[PDB]
Design a protein around this ligand. Sequence first.
Ligand SMILES: CC/C=C\C/C=C\C/C=C\C/C=C\C/C=C\CCCC(=O)OC[C@H](CO[C@@H]1O[C@H](CO[C@H]2O[C@@H](CO)[C@H](O)[C@H](O)[C@H]2O)[C@H](O)[C@H](O)[C@H]1O)OC(=O)C/C=C/C/C=C\C/C=C\C/C=C\C/C=C\CC
Ligand SMILES: CC/C=C\C/C=C\C/C=C\C/C=C\C/C=C\CCCC(=O)OC[C@H](CO[C@@H]1O[C@H](CO[C@H]2O[C@@H](CO)[C@H](O)[C@H](O)[C@H]2O)[C@H](O)[C@H](O)[C@H]1O)OC(=O)C/C=C/C/C=C\C/C=C\C/C=C\C/C=C\CC
Ligand code: CLA
Ligand code: CLA
Ligand SMILES: CC(=O)O[C@H]1CC(C)(C)C(=C=C/C(C)=C/C=C/C=C/C=C(C)/C=C2C=C(/C=C/[C@@]34O[C@]3(C)C[C@@H](O)CC4(C)C)C(=O)O/2)[C@](C)(O)C1
Ligand SMILES: CC(=O)O[C@H]1CC(C)(C)C(=C=C/C(C)=C/C=C/C=C/C=C(C)/C=C2C=C(/C=C/[C@@]34O[C@]3(C)C[C@@H](O)CC4(C)C)C(=O)O/2)[C@](C)(O)C1
Ligand SMILES: CC(=O)O[C@H]1CC(C)(C)C(=C=C/C(C)=C/C=C/C=C/C=C(C)/C=C2C=C(/C=C/[C@@]34O[C@]3(C)C[C@@H](O)CC4(C)C)C(=O)O/2)[C@](C)(O)C1
Ligand SMILES: CC(=O)O[C@H]1CC(C)(C)C(=C=C/C(C)=C/C=C/C=C/C=C(C)/C=C2C=C(/C=C/[C@@]34O[C@]3(C)C[C@@H](O)CC4(C)C)C(=O)O/2)[C@](C)(O)C1
Ligand SMILES: CC(=O)O[C@H]1CC(C)(C)C(=C=C/C(C)=C/C=C/C=C/C=C(C)/C=C2C=C(/C=C/[C@@]34O[C@]3(C)C[C@@H](O)CC4(C)C)C(=O)O/2)[C@](C)(O)C1
Ligand SMILES: CC(=O)O[C@H]1CC(C)(C)C(=C=C/C(C)=C/C=C/C=C/C=C(C)/C=C2C=C(/C=C/[C@@]34O[C@]3(C)C[C@@H](O)CC4(C)C)C(=O)O/2)[C@](C)(O)C1
Ligand SMILES: CC(=O)O[C@H]1CC(C)(C)C(=C=C/C(C)=C/C=C/C=C/C=C(C)/C=C2C=C(/C=C/[C@@]34O[C@]3(C)C[C@@H](O)CC4(C)C)C(=O)O/2)[C@](C)(O)C1
Ligand SMILES: CC(=O)O[C@H]1CC(C)(C)C(=C=C/C(C)=C/C=C/C=C/C=C(C)/C=C2C=C(/C=C/[C@@]34O[C@]3(C)C[C@@H](O)CC4(C)C)C(=O)O/2)[C@](C)(O)C1
Ligand SMILES: [Cl-]
Ligand SMILES: [Cl-]
Ligand SMILES: [Cl-]
Ligand SMILES: [Cl-]
Ligand SMILES: [Cl-]
Ligand SMILES: [Cl-]
Lengths: 151, 151
Amino acid sequence: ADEIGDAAKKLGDASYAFAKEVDWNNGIFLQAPGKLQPLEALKAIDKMIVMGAAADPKLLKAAAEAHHKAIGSVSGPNGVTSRADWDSVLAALGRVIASVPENMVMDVYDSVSKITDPKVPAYMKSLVNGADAEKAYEGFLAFKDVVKKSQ
Amino acid sequence: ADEIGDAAKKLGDASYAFAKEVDWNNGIFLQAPGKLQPLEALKAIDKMIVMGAAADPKLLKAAAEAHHKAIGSVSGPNGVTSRADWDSVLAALGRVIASVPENMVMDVYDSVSKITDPKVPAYMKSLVNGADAEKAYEGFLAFKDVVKKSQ
Ligand SMILES: CC/C=C\C/C=C\C/C=C\C/C=C\C/C=C\CCCC(=O)OC[C@H](CO[C@@H]1O[C@H](CO[C@H]2O[C@@H](CO)[C@H](O)[C@H](O)[C@H]2O)[C@H](O)[C@H](O)[C@H]1O)OC(=O)C/C=C/C/C=C\C/C=C\C/C=C\C/C=C\CC
Ligand SMILES: CC/C=C\C/C=C\C/C=C\C/C=C\C/C=C\CCCC(=O)OC[C@H](CO[C@@H]1O[C@H](CO[C@H]2O[C@@H](CO)[C@H](O)[C@H](O)[C@H]2O)[C@H](O)[C@H](O)[C@H]1O)OC(=O)C/C=C/C/C=C\C/C=C\C/C=C\C/C=C\CC
Ligand code: CLA
Ligand code: CLA
Ligand SMILES: CC(=O)O[C@H]1CC(C)(C)C(=C=C/C(C)=C/C=C/C=C/C=C(C)/C=C2C=C(/C=C/[C@@]34O[C@]3(C)C[C@@H](O)CC4(C)C)C(=O)O/2)[C@](C)(O)C1
Ligand SMILES: CC(=O)O[C@H]1CC(C)(C)C(=C=C/C(C)=C/C=C/C=C/C=C(C)/C=C2C=C(/C=C/[C@@]34O[C@]3(C)C[C@@H](O)CC4(C)C)C(=O)O/2)[C@](C)(O)C1
Ligand SMILES: CC(=O)O[C@H]1CC(C)(C)C(=C=C/C(C)=C/C=C/C=C/C=C(C)/C=C2C=C(/C=C/[C@@]34O[C@]3(C)C[C@@H](O)CC4(C)C)C(=O)O/2)[C@](C)(O)C1
Ligand SMILES: CC(=O)O[C@H]1CC(C)(C)C(=C=C/C(C)=C/C=C/C=C/C=C(C)/C=C2C=C(/C=C/[C@@]34O[C@]3(C)C[C@@H](O)CC4(C)C)C(=O)O/2)[C@](C)(O)C1
Ligand SMILES: CC(=O)O[C@H]1CC(C)(C)C(=C=C/C(C)=C/C=C/C=C/C=C(C)/C=C2C=C(/C=C/[C@@]34O[C@]3(C)C[C@@H](O)CC4(C)C)C(=O)O/2)[C@](C)(O)C1
Ligand SMILES: CC(=O)O[C@H]1CC(C)(C)C(=C=C/C(C)=C/C=C/C=C/C=C(C)/C=C2C=C(/C=C/[C@@]34O[C@]3(C)C[C@@H](O)CC4(C)C)C(=O)O/2)[C@](C)(O)C1
Ligand SMILES: CC(=O)O[C@H]1CC(C)(C)C(=C=C/C(C)=C/C=C/C=C/C=C(C)/C=C2C=C(/C=C/[C@@]34O[C@]3(C)C[C@@H](O)CC4(C)C)C(=O)O/2)[C@](C)(O)C1
Ligand SMILES: CC(=O)O[C@H]1CC(C)(C)C(=C=C/C(C)=C/C=C/C=C/C=C(C)/C=C2C=C(/C=C/[C@@]34O[C@]3(C)C[C@@H](O)CC4(C)C)C(=O)O/2)[C@](C)(O)C1
Ligand SMILES: [Cl-]
Ligand SMILES: [Cl-]
Ligand SMILES: [Cl-]
Ligand SMILES: [Cl-]
Ligand SMILES: [Cl-]
Ligand SMILES: [Cl-]
């Protein structure tokens, strides 16, 4: 057990209602988040590859295993994993984030932002309960503070 | 040095002409290989996640690092990495393949085949020199024999 695991439980309390509202079987998630921009997108994928290569290999393995288990508990009309597997995935990914320098994480974020059209977040939010999305995000802000203290 | 590295050099001799002909900046590679089928595609991604979790973590790391280096040497009108980085990537991925049971590799292949429309391979080949694609594939058949002997 660790503090990221405890924080994941709190993040799940804040975000699971939102996760249940997302239609995970929507084909839109295969599309570019805006206009297709292969050269800029490759720069974002490169930042991700740098981060993956730097991440703790055991924690990457554990995060993959948590997603396999999560796939097994998918149910209902939107393809949402169980609450326990949601929290599991959250914690395992927080451990991966904490295992690399903050700059690597920010480089991924900035590089993906550069290819994400400004309309995309609001369009995604419009498909779910807005107050549940805001609680999820408020949860995320608390969670990342715990992740940073482990990083 | 190892035998997969030697075999990668031979595979590069057989396949680099084909790699130069692929337009790696074509946006088509973001599309589903056929009809979008989220439930079947999730089963394929699950097989990939199982395989990733089973793969040697050092060899996964080395394979990510080889792709970062390959991105750095991209040149020319089609986005093709250098010959040396092509071979590097080939060898690093062969090591990853060899690090898991043959069944895990076959499960990915079968699960992706199930979502790939029969027209897709011929459409891809039609964009390149067909004889260069066949040589690349003949190369691949020799290479996998070396990979299997390490597996
Ligand atoms: C063949 C290739 C195959 C596959 C293709 C490969 C990849 C797919 C590529 C791209 C598609 C992926 C994602 C794009 C898809 C979807 C987008 C998902 C991201 C999103 O929706 O983000 C919304 C966020 C909203 O803006 C925030 O608003 C805040 C408001 O907060 C206030 O008020 C309250 C609010 O209620 C709160 O309570 C607070 O108390 C109070 O403070 C503040 O002003 C913040 O400063 C401001 O940042 O927008 C950004 O962060 C901008 C960058 C986005 C970068 C994009 C993404 C995140 C970055 C990195 C994630 C990492 C990786 C994502 C990618 C993959 C995951 C591994
Ligand atoms: C949000 C989500 C984000 C992203 C989306 C995620 C993923 C994208 C998902 C899917 C898109 C990816 C791929 C689909 C895209 C593109 C497709 C790329 C694959 C392709 O084109 O394959 C062509 C191949 C042709 O068939 C072969 O013909 C042979 C003929 O050989 C003879 O004659 C001569 C010939 O010249 C030779 O010299 C020889 O001497 C002589 O023997 C034999 O008859 C073989 O028995 C027969 O197998 O077709 C198959 O293998 C069928 C399954 C395909 C499964 C598909 C793929 C491979 C499987 C696994 C690869 C693993 C993974 C691929 C995926 C990713 C990579 C990591
Ligand atoms: C099995 C299939 C699968 C699927 C469908 C997904 C889907 C996703 N992954 Mg995951 N992933 C997988 C397997 C999968 N992954 C595997 C096998 C690994 C390797 C172990 C990873 C490792 C991974 C990492 C390291 C990251 C993702 C992230 C993401 C998201 C990217 C888009 C995004 O940011 O949306 C928005 C995100 C969500 C809807 C998820 C919940 C986010 C918080 C907790 C609540 C919502 C807050 C707010 C409303 C929206 C996001 C704001 C943002 C600025 C934080 C998306 C939800 C990224 C992510 O979530 O970035 C924010 C991310 O950093 N994945
Ligand atoms: C950086 C960006 C990037 C890009 C653009 C790609 C692109 C691709 N990856 Mg790679 N990958 C990346 C990074 C990237 N990857 C990273 C960071 C990792 C983690 C370390 C991986 C790990 C990985 C694995 C483990 C595998 C791939 C494979 C593939 C291919 C999947 C589609 C396919 O089979 O086409 C067809 C494939 C090609 C055009 C590549 C050359 C194949 C041979 C050597 C020559 C051509 C033979 C024939 C004509 C066509 C293929 C037949 C097939 C049955 C073998 C595609 C070319 C898969 C693949 O190639 O499966 C066959 C695969 O198994 N990737
Ligand atoms: C082979 C292998 O290993 O693959 C594995 C690799 C990983 C990394 C482990 C993995 C993973 C995670 C991944 C990739 C997550 C990707 C998430 C992508 C989210 C994409 C989104 C939100 C896309 C969009 C597009 C939108 C478009 C909206 C608009 O256009 C619309 C409609 C109308 C316009 O007028 C205005 C507009 C509003 C602009 C939108 O609103 O959102 C996975 C899944 O496991 C597969
Ligand atoms: C060996 C191998 O194969 O590894 C493979 C391993 C994987 C995992 C499969 C893989 C992969 C994918 C990877 C690495 C994905 C990385 C994801 C990173 C996500 C980062 C995020 C969300 C970062 C941020 C930063 C934010 C900042 C927000 C704020 O600053 C803002 C604006 C304003 C401030 O006022 C307050 C604030 C709120 C602080 C935010 O909100 O979010 C890959 C590439 O396939 C390689
Ligand atoms: C088709 C289908 O059914 O698919 C199903 C597939 C599944 C897998 C079964 C499934 C599921 C679950 C899923 C996708 C869960 C996704 C979870 C994503 C979690 C992401 C996390 C935690 C990312 C971050 C990034 C962080 C960054 C933190 C920092 O940068 C910040 C901010 C500020 C810096 O100053 C400090 C910092 C610390 C560096 C962090 O702290 O955390 C589902 C829903 O069932 C759908
Ligand atoms: C080859 C093939 O077929 O592969 C298949 C493989 C798969 C895995 C099966 C597959 C898949 C599934 C995938 C990747 C799913 C990814 C899901 C990502 C969902 C992202 C969502 C919901 C994003 C948001 C962002 C929002 C933002 C809300 C806010 O910012 C807003 C506006 C303003 C403020 O208020 C603050 C805020 C509250 C922060 C929100 O509210 O939500 C797919 C697509 O089928 C393809
Ligand atoms: C977040 C993160 O970590 O992401 C990283 C995760 C990884 C795994 C490390 C990673 C990787 C590798 C990946 C995903 C490789 C994916 C390869 C996909 C190839 C897709 C292809 C060929 C798609 C198609 C679609 C086609 C459609 C053709 C047709 O429709 C057409 C025109 C006309 C119809 O009438 C007939 C038709 C002929 C049917 C086609 O012919 O081909 C990467 C890139 O690094 C990103
Ligand atoms: C911890 C963590 O995050 O790990 C992350 C790590 C990654 C790597 C980023 C990641 C990923 C992606 C993964 C695993 C991809 C796996 C790819 C597997 C590819 C397999 C292939 C091509 C298999 C085959 C089999 C074939 C068989 C062909 C033949 O039998 C046939 C028909 C007919 C016979 O007569 C002769 C024959 C010729 C023998 C073939 O031709 O090809 C993921 C999921 O993101 C998780
Ligand atoms: C937009 C842009 O510019 O992107 C740029 C991005 C880059 C990265 C810079 C770039 C590049 C390079 C790229 C993509 C290289 C891709 C290489 C893929 C290699 C795949 C390999 C080896 C896969 C396999 C699978 C195997 C399976 C073998 C077996 O199953 C088989 C058969 C039969 C079983 O009985 C035994 C077995 C042994 C189990 C194997 O043996 O090997 C490029 C081109 O520049 C484009
Ligand atoms: C959010 C966002 O924007 O992400 C961006 C991220 C990136 C990385 C920048 C990005 C990208 C690039 C990607 C994934 C590139 C993937 C390339 C895959 C290429 C696959 C090819 C060529 C496949 C084939 C198959 C063929 C088959 C030929 C044969 O079987 C045939 C018919 C018959 C026999 O003769 C035998 C044979 C000879 C075997 C062939 O000849 O070729 C993208 C798309 O821009 C999206
Ligand atoms: Cl505890
Ligand atoms: Cl505490
Ligand atoms: Cl636009
Ligand atoms: Cl040697
Ligand atoms: Cl020898
Ligand atoms: Cl069809």
